[PDB]
Design a protein around this nucleic acid. Structure first.
Ligand SMILES: [Mg+2]
Ligand SMILES: [Mg+2]
Ligand SMILES: [Mg+2]
Ligand SMILES: [Mg+2]
Ligand SMILES: [Mg+2]
Ligand SMILES: [Mg+2]
Ligand SMILES: [Mg+2]
Ligand SMILES: [Mg+2]
Ligand SMILES: [Mg+2]
Ligand SMILES: [Mg+2]
Ligand SMILES: [Mg+2]
Ligand SMILES: [Mg+2]
Ligand SMILES: [Mg+2]
Ligand SMILES: [Mg+2]
Ligand SMILES: [Mg+2]
Ligand SMILES: [Mg+2]
Ligand SMILES: [Mg+2]
Ligand SMILES: [Mg+2]
Ligand SMILES: [Mg+2]
Ligand SMILES: [Mg+2]
Ligand SMILES: [Mg+2]
Ligand SMILES: [Mg+2]
Ligand SMILES: [Mg+2]
Ligand SMILES: [Mg+2]
Ligand SMILES: [Mg+2]
Ligand SMILES: [Mg+2]
Ligand SMILES: [Mg+2]
Ligand SMILES: [Mg+2]
Ligand SMILES: [Mg+2]
Ligand SMILES: [Mg+2]
Ligand SMILES: [Mg+2]
Ligand SMILES: [Mg+2]
Ligand SMILES: [Mg+2]
Ligand SMILES: [Mg+2]
Ligand SMILES: [Mg+2]
Ligand SMILES: [Mg+2]
Ligand SMILES: [Mg+2]
Ligand SMILES: [Mg+2]
Ligand SMILES: [Mg+2]
Ligand SMILES: [Mg+2]
Ligand SMILES: [Mg+2]
Ligand SMILES: [Mg+2]
Ligand SMILES: [Mg+2]
Ligand SMILES: [Mg+2]
Ligand SMILES: [Mg+2]
Ligand SMILES: [Mg+2]
Ligand SMILES: [Mg+2]
Ligand SMILES: [Mg+2]
Ligand SMILES: [Mg+2]
Ligand SMILES: [Mg+2]
Ligand SMILES: [Mg+2]
Ligand SMILES: [Mg+2]
Ligand SMILES: [Mg+2]
Ligand SMILES: [Mg+2]
Ligand SMILES: [Mg+2]
Ligand SMILES: [Mg+2]
Ligand SMILES: [Mg+2]
Ligand SMILES: [Mg+2]
Ligand SMILES: [Mg+2]
Ligand SMILES: [Mg+2]
Ligand SMILES: [Mg+2]
Ligand SMILES: [Mg+2]
Ligand SMILES: [Mg+2]
Ligand SMILES: [Mg+2]
Ligand SMILES: [Mg+2]
Ligand SMILES: [Mg+2]
Ligand SMILES: [Mg+2]
Ligand SMILES: [Mg+2]
Ligand SMILES: [Mg+2]
Ligand SMILES: [Mg+2]
Ligand SMILES: [Mg+2]
Ligand SMILES: [Mg+2]
Ligand SMILES: [Mg+2]
Ligand SMILES: [Mg+2]
Ligand SMILES: [Mg+2]
Ligand SMILES: [Mg+2]
Ligand SMILES: [Mg+2]
Ligand SMILES: [Mg+2]
Ligand SMILES: [Mg+2]
Ligand SMILES: [Mg+2]
Ligand SMILES: [Mg+2]
Ligand SMILES: [Mg+2]
Ligand SMILES: [Mg+2]
Ligand SMILES: [Mg+2]
Ligand SMILES: [Mg+2]
Ligand SMILES: [Mg+2]
Ligand SMILES: [Mg+2]
Ligand SMILES: [Mg+2]
Ligand SMILES: [Mg+2]
Ligand SMILES: [Mg+2]
Ligand SMILES: [Mg+2]
Ligand SMILES: [Mg+2]
Ligand SMILES: [Mg+2]
Ligand SMILES: [Mg+2]
Ligand SMILES: [Mg+2]
Ligand SMILES: [Mg+2]
Ligand SMILES: [Mg+2]
Ligand SMILES: [Mg+2]
Ligand SMILES: [Mg+2]
Ligand SMILES: [Mg+2]
Ligand SMILES: [Mg+2]
Ligand SMILES: [Mg+2]
Ligand SMILES: [Mg+2]
Ligand SMILES: [Mg+2]
Ligand SMILES: [Mg+2]
Ligand SMILES: [Mg+2]
Ligand SMILES: [Mg+2]
Ligand SMILES: [Mg+2]
Ligand SMILES: [Mg+2]
Ligand SMILES: [Mg+2]
Ligand SMILES: [Mg+2]
Ligand SMILES: [Mg+2]
Ligand SMILES: [Mg+2]
Ligand SMILES: [Mg+2]
Ligand SMILES: [Mg+2]
Ligand SMILES: [Mg+2]
Ligand SMILES: [Mg+2]
Ligand SMILES: [Mg+2]
Ligand SMILES: [Mg+2]
Ligand SMILES: [Mg+2]
Ligand SMILES: [Mg+2]
Ligand SMILES: [Mg+2]
Ligand SMILES: [Mg+2]
Ligand SMILES: [Mg+2]
Ligand SMILES: [Mg+2]
Ligand SMILES: [Mg+2]
Ligand SMILES: [Mg+2]
Ligand SMILES: [Mg+2]
Ligand SMILES: [Mg+2]
Ligand SMILES: [Mg+2]
Ligand SMILES: [Mg+2]
Ligand SMILES: [Mg+2]
Ligand SMILES: [Mg+2]
Ligand SMILES: [Mg+2]
Ligand SMILES: [Mg+2]
Ligand SMILES: [Mg+2]
Ligand SMILES: [Mg+2]
Ligand SMILES: [Mg+2]
Ligand SMILES: [Mg+2]
Ligand SMILES: [Mg+2]
Ligand SMILES: [Mg+2]
Ligand SMILES: [Mg+2]
Ligand SMILES: [Mg+2]
Ligand SMILES: [Mg+2]
Ligand SMILES: [Mg+2]
Ligand SMILES: [Mg+2]
Ligand SMILES: [Mg+2]
Ligand SMILES: [Mg+2]
Ligand SMILES: [Mg+2]
Ligand SMILES: [Mg+2]
Ligand SMILES: [Mg+2]
Ligand SMILES: [Mg+2]
Ligand SMILES: [Mg+2]
Ligand SMILES: [Mg+2]
Ligand SMILES: [Mg+2]
Ligand SMILES: [Mg+2]
Ligand SMILES: [Mg+2]
Ligand SMILES: [Mg+2]
Ligand SMILES: [Mg+2]
Ligand SMILES: [Mg+2]
Ligand SMILES: [Mg+2]
Ligand SMILES: [Mg+2]
Ligand SMILES: [Mg+2]
Ligand SMILES: [Mg+2]
Ligand SMILES: [Mg+2]
Ligand SMILES: [Zn+2]
Lengths: 131, 59, 122, 204, 118, 19
RNA sequence: CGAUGUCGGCUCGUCGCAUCCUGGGGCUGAAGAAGGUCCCAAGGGUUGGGCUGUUCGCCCAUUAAAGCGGCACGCGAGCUGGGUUCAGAACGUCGUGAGACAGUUCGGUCUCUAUCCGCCACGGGCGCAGGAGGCUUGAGGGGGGCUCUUCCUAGUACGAGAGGACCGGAAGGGACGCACCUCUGGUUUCCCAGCUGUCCCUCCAGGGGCAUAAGCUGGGUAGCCAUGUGCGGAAGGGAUAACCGCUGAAAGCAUCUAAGCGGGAAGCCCGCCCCAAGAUGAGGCCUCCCACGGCAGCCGGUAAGGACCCGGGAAGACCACCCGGUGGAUGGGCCGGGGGUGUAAGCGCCGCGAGGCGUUGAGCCGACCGGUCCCAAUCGUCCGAGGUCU
RNA sequence: GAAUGCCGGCAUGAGUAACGAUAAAGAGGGUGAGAAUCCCUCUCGCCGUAAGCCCAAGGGUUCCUACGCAAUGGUCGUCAG
RNA sequence: CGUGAGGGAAAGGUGAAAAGAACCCCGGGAGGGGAGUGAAAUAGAGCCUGAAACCGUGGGCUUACAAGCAGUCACGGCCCC
């Protein structure tokens, strides 16, 4: 008996692959399936990912954004069927895994703290150049 | 707290009855395969210094 | 999670700036109110010549909470403040605008006028 | 009344119709009938079921002999299901379809000697305002000279958990016959690797 | 409770318990065999085995790693030069505990021996 | 519930000097 | 009176019913809705605040309701000490005075060890006529027992209107309870990182101690958790309470009753969950050993079995329970995976330098899912049936 | 036979509370009838306006060395005021 | 014990005679067992007599479905004379 495997087996049918890799500090845009009345649609959450907690199929990430003066934070299952796509809008270079600390920073400060990850940005442009 | 105290002297009978569980259990001992001395199992024989066939320590 | 003694930012143009919860109107003894729940609240801070004034006891619906609220899809959403919109006894907002985003849950709880008046519905 | 022995393997959530639904995965079968309890012989109606293969080097002669009369390979756990008489000589996960609801019995996690706050959700004392060495104490336990004693069944501190617990009317989310897997929605008593019993629900 | 907790407390606080394992390790590596109470012995197995495995890497990193616990440069040399080579072909389990057949007089503690394996 | 307030029968216990 | 600690609060309750709510009714000056009044009913429920030491009461906001009482005005070897019985001090008032006042005011030592009963938990012993390993029956006992809003029926019945249902159906809640840890959110005493001062190793670099019983800070797996998730209250059957009848005399009529029958409560019985054969009334089934030697007794070796001892465990205070003991994956190591931290040291390059860049998601790395006999569970010992009599 | 009597002896509570600052220990080697506790070594921790050093009160052989371990030392003891 | 005035205990007996147990044995010692003295050694110095509470070893009878001021009256069983 391998309980771990047995779990991963149950999870496998729901595991997703089409999502791009990203790190905390990256500015990302989640395109999300949303229901209202009574049709469904896409709503885009564009903000900085400030946490990624890992548990295999059960990993989840947190995306932070200010909208109309109020900061908002959303948590998504990294394998949520309701995500249409995730677009990398920017690479950020953090020095730690969780960026709760940006909750108390001005726009100036967030910027000087989260300078652009020039290395991984190049990797991005160096990719896409496809045959 | 108001200093509990015994209300009555315990009888010779009742205290000895308490002590019906106080019997020691004799040491559990096996003979040493090498030198045939009695010793506690899973220990290294303090008579010859053998355990699991080989000589392990100076006795 | 709102409870009696909690302060709420009021996100409308009724004139109120701060209200303090004095009761959650959800059954006989709810310990907490969340988004979409209606509370009773004393007005603790208000601007001159508003529709409402400091001291007024009012009803309002929570539209934003700092405690993240979980959705059936396994997602969550969390706000930087606790905010409410002041309403009348028929769930209708007394103001003419609402400021900042509101929780989508308001819609399933029959507060369409607010959802409409909201700049964003996350 | 149907039922099967099984082991709790763990928890996850899956997605179904745009909903997250937490599930406890249960490795259910397969359980061979090793004895059938009949009215004329035993006084009632049940099936003794086996579960999990055992190393015959560990199974004594009286047990070995029992297994033999059923022509069954030595099993670790012998357990009965009341008012159950499957037609097979073997019970599999297939006795459940998804959508059906079940009651699950396990042995709850053991808190050992639990205080009265953890056991019975007592309130304990103030943590300040004068409180003296009674922060987690149970308080009063009685009246005075009348009745001059403590009720039988008085909630007090003591051992808690490691007991038989039956959560009821749990929805079967999915079943995977190829791997003997049962997916039950919600919580199930006891630890991962713990033995469980899964029965047809008694709630209508 | 204690459910699935790993590692003893040995009635010492964190820094004391850490000092303990280090000073025990240093002794084990020094004399190759020591006598302690059985629980400390069982707990020393893993603490030292890691250090031995690290000497089997030999890299400057591992040296500077082991140095954190063992502190003695000459001892680390002996670890790398004389000891680690013996276990090049052994995959873990560089230490053994055998329980002695007598107890301390002063407090009746059960004793065991911890030795570097051949 | 008793209305006429009923007075203390005993004083608050106080310590003695211990011989 | 060789002492029965005294208000209020807190904690923890249990009980009564003269019932606050919810369930069932009759009468109504009951159109409906909403009330009034009485009957039955003690199963469960009976909110959070302001004032005051207050109980009580008023008040704010809710509510299905915010019930009343008993238990030494329940509960200080459970806590509190605001009230009030000491000594200090002051105001009013009384007294020439010392002092005094159901007049006020500020302050003011509440005792680590439970013997017996009782209560919660857990064992050891013997018994249940052979000795054993399983699996069960359920006598008996405990747990639980709450309730609202909206929608449909239907703006129908009813009503001049305002208003507005019965019955039946659907969805969603509050408090509570049991379990759980996938998610959310905690902790996570050394799992990683950064930082200061000092002292040290070995000078640089790299490190270590100490600053708490983590020096400090940012994070944090398993686990244990609630704020998080699942699930429960039932359904249903039986008998009833108040009440309503059917048939029906005594009494040519009438009558729920005297014969007989039916309907009828959140209550009672059962059903559900948990304990349970010391249920000495000691139950049942499946399987194992067996006709021992010696003098319903004793003695000795055994059978099946078990205990010891050992490695351990989401089991646990010790005990118990459970798994494993080389014909083995039990713990320790080691390996892979997970996970955390967030790009180690060294080198090279750019910079006067603090630094930066690359090698690099690097290095480190508790507990989680596994693999692997490298280390350790070596070797053994003692118990343990011969089956009482009609 | 009783005076919460007087003196003494011996029980009960009980193998119970406790063993006096949570600055902290580990191993190796000696000695010895006996060693967690004595000697040595190495590692670790604590004090450092002291928990170091000198003086005065007070104490009055407690100082040094050899030989001892019945009692004293809250355990042990080969050690010691 | 109290600064002091002052308070103020407990504690007798080997045997006629030390003849006070050489020597041997276990033990580090203490202590014991032999030997020896003695009329007597449970007169062995922790010594005349050696009560009682209290503690223990052996033995007979008895006790784990039973309700208590513990006894008393009857009967039965078992053990002893
Ligand atoms: Mg106290
Ligand atoms: Mg007696
Ligand atoms: Mg006795
Ligand atoms: Mg007793
Ligand atoms: Mg606003
Ligand atoms: Mg004003
Ligand atoms: Mg079970
Ligand atoms: Mg609890
Ligand atoms: Mg609980
Ligand atoms: Mg509390
Ligand atoms: Mg409270
Ligand atoms: Mg106090
Ligand atoms: Mg206390
Ligand atoms: Mg305290
Ligand atoms: Mg009574
Ligand atoms: Mg238990
Ligand atoms: Mg703890
Ligand atoms: Mg473990
Ligand atoms: Mg550690
Ligand atoms: Mg542990
Ligand atoms: Mg310690
Ligand atoms: Mg200790
Ligand atoms: Mg420290
Ligand atoms: Mg330390
Ligand atoms: Mg031993
Ligand atoms: Mg000792
Ligand atoms: Mg009196
Ligand atoms: Mg008295
Ligand atoms: Mg008294
Ligand atoms: Mg008294
Ligand atoms: Mg009345
Ligand atoms: Mg009523
Ligand atoms: Mg009614
Ligand atoms: Mg009525
Ligand atoms: Mg009506
Ligand atoms: Mg009317
Ligand atoms: Mg009544
Ligand atoms: Mg009731
Ligand atoms: Mg009541
Ligand atoms: Mg109130
Ligand atoms: Mg106030
Ligand atoms: Mg207040
Ligand atoms: Mg009041
Ligand atoms: Mg009043
Ligand atoms: Mg209402
Ligand atoms: Mg009402
Ligand atoms: Mg009503
Ligand atoms: Mg009451
Ligand atoms: Mg009282
Ligand atoms: Mg009281
Ligand atoms: Mg009181
Ligand atoms: Mg009392
Ligand atoms: Mg007071
Ligand atoms: Mg006070
Ligand atoms: Mg007073
Ligand atoms: Mg006074
Ligand atoms: Mg005057
Ligand atoms: Mg008064
Ligand atoms: Mg007075
Ligand atoms: Mg006064
Ligand atoms: Mg004061
Ligand atoms: Mg006062
Ligand atoms: Mg008190
Ligand atoms: Mg204490
Ligand atoms: Mg007791
Ligand atoms: Mg009693
Ligand atoms: Mg028992
Ligand atoms: Mg049973
Ligand atoms: Mg029953
Ligand atoms: Mg009974
Ligand atoms: Mg019942
Ligand atoms: Mg309508
Ligand atoms: Mg109309
Ligand atoms: Mg209806
Ligand atoms: Mg987990
Ligand atoms: Mg969590
Ligand atoms: Mg979390
Ligand atoms: Mg570390
Ligand atoms: Mg430093
Ligand atoms: Mg340096
Ligand atoms: Mg230092
Ligand atoms: Mg220091
Ligand atoms: Mg310090
Ligand atoms: Mg320290
Ligand atoms: Mg540190
Ligand atoms: Mg955190
Ligand atoms: Mg964790
Ligand atoms: Mg008639
Ligand atoms: Mg009749
Ligand atoms: Mg009837
Ligand atoms: Mg009828
Ligand atoms: Mg009737
Ligand atoms: Mg009926
Ligand atoms: Mg109900
Ligand atoms: Mg059972
Ligand atoms: Mg039985
Ligand atoms: Mg009976
Ligand atoms: Mg039986
Ligand atoms: Mg039967
Ligand atoms: Mg026979
Ligand atoms: Mg446990
Ligand atoms: Mg254990
Ligand atoms: Mg076994
Ligand atoms: Mg064996
Ligand atoms: Mg293993
Ligand atoms: Mg392993
Ligand atoms: Mg990873
Ligand atoms: Mg770098
Ligand atoms: Mg580097
Ligand atoms: Mg570098
Ligand atoms: Mg340069
Ligand atoms: Mg990594
Ligand atoms: Mg790894
Ligand atoms: Mg293998
Ligand atoms: Mg035998
Ligand atoms: Mg007399
Ligand atoms: Mg006398
Ligand atoms: Mg006295
Ligand atoms: Mg007395
Ligand atoms: Mg006396
Ligand atoms: Mg003891
Ligand atoms: Mg006691
Ligand atoms: Mg105790
Ligand atoms: Mg004490
Ligand atoms: Mg103790
Ligand atoms: Mg001390
Ligand atoms: Mg003390
Ligand atoms: Mg101490
Ligand atoms: Mg030593
Ligand atoms: Mg030594
Ligand atoms: Mg030695
Ligand atoms: Mg000597
Ligand atoms: Mg010491
Ligand atoms: Mg200094
Ligand atoms: Mg200082
Ligand atoms: Mg002196
Ligand atoms: Mg000397
Ligand atoms: Mg001495
Ligand atoms: Mg001695
Ligand atoms: Mg001497
Ligand atoms: Mg001593
Ligand atoms: Mg002392
Ligand atoms: Mg000296
Ligand atoms: Mg004097
Ligand atoms: Mg004489
Ligand atoms: Mg003479
Ligand atoms: Mg002699
Ligand atoms: Mg002698
Ligand atoms: Mg003679
Ligand atoms: Mg003679
Ligand atoms: Mg004569
Ligand atoms: Mg003699
Ligand atoms: Mg005599
Ligand atoms: Mg004599
Ligand atoms: Mg004498
Ligand atoms: Mg004479
Ligand atoms: Mg004598
Ligand atoms: Mg005598
Ligand atoms: Mg006897
Ligand atoms: Mg009976
Ligand atoms: Mg009997
Ligand atoms: Mg009796
Ligand atoms: Mg009597
Ligand atoms: Mg008679
Ligand atoms: Mg007789
Ligand atoms: Zn031997």
């Amino acid at each position: 008996m391998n309980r771990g495997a047995l779990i991963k087996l149950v999870e496998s049918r729901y595991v997703r692959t089409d999502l791009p890799e990203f790190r905390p500090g990256d500015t990302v845009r989640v395109s999300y399936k949303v229901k209202e009345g009574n049709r469904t649609r896409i709503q885009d959450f564009e903000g900085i990912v400030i946490r990624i907690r890992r548990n295999g199929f059960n990993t989840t990430f947190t995306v932070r954004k200010v909208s109309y003066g109020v900061g908002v934070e959303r948590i998504f299952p990294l394998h949520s069927p309701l995500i249409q796509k995730i677009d990398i809008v920017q690479r950020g270079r953090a020095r730690r895994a969780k960026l709760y600390f940006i909750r108390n920073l001005s726009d100036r400060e967030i910027r000087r703290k989260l300078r652009a990850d020039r290395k991984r940005i190049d990797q991005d442009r160096a990719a896409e150049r496809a045959a | 707290a108001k200093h509990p105290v015994p209300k009555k002297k315990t009888s010779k009978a009742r205290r000895d009855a308490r002590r019906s569980h106080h019997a020691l259990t004799p040491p559990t001992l096996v003979p040493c395969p090498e030198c045939k001395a009695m010793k506690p199992p899973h220990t290294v024989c303090p008579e010859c210094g053998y355990y699991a066939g080989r000589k392990v320590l100076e006795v | 999670m709102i409870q009696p003694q909690t302060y709420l930012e009021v996100a409308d143009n009724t004139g109120a700036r701060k209200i303090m919860c004095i009761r959650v109107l959800k059954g006989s003894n709810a310990k907490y109110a969340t988004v979409g729940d209606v509370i009773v609240a004393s007005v603790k801070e208000a601007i001159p010549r508003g529709a409402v004034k400091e001291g007024d006891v009012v009803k309002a619906v929570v539209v934003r909470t700092k405690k993240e609220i979980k959705r059936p899809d396994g997602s969550a959403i969390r706000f930087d403040d606790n905010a409410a919109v002041i309403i009348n006894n028929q769930l209708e907002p007394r103001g003419t605008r609402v400021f900042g985003p509101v929780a989508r849950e308001l819609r399933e709880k029959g507060f369409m006028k607010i959802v409409s008046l909201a700049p964003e519905v996350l | 009344m149907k039922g099967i022995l099984g082991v709790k393997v763990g928890m996850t959530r899956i997605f179904r119709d745009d909903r997250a639904v937490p599930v406890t995965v249960i490795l259910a079968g397969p359980c061979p009938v090793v004895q059938r309890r009949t009215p004329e012989k035993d006084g009632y109606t049940a099936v003794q079921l086996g579960f999990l293969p055992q190393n015959p080097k560990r199974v004594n002669r009286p047990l070995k002999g029992h297994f033999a009369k059923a022509g069954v390979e030595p099993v670790r756990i012998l357990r009965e299901i009341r008012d159950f008489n499957p037609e097979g000589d073997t019970v599999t996960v297939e006795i459940f379809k998804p959508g059906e609801r079940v009651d699950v019995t396990g042995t709850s996690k053991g808190r050992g000697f639990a205080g009265v706050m953890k056991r019975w959700n007592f309130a304990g004392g103030p943590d300040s305002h004068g409180a003296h060495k009674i922060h987690r104490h149970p308080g009063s336990i009685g009246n005075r000279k009348t009745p001059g004693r403590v009720y039988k069944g008085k909630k007090m501190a003591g051992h808690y958990g490691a007991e038989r617990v039956t959560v009821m009317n749990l929805e079967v989310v999915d079943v995977i016959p190829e791997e003997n897997l049962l997916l039950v929605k919600g919580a199930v008593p006891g630890p991962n690797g713990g033995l469980v019993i899964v029965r047809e629900t008694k709630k209508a | 409770m204690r459910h699935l907790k790993s590692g003893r407390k040995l009635n010492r606080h964190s820094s004391h318990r850490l000092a303990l394992y280090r000073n025990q390790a240093k002794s084990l590596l020094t004399h190759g065999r020591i006598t302690t109470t059985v629980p400390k012995a069982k707990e020393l197995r893993g603490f030292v085995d890691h250090l031995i495995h690290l000497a089997k890497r030999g890299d400057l990193h591992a040296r500077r790693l082991v140095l954190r616990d063992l502190q003695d440069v000459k001892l680390v040399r002996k670890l790398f030069d004389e000891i680690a080579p013996r276990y090049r072909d052994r995959q873990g389990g560089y230490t053994r505990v055998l329980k002695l057949a007598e107890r301390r007089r002063g407090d009746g503690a059960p004793l065991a021996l911890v030795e570097l394996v051949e | 519930r008793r209305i006429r307030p009923r007075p203390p029968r005993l004083p608050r216990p106080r310590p003695r000097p211990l011989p």
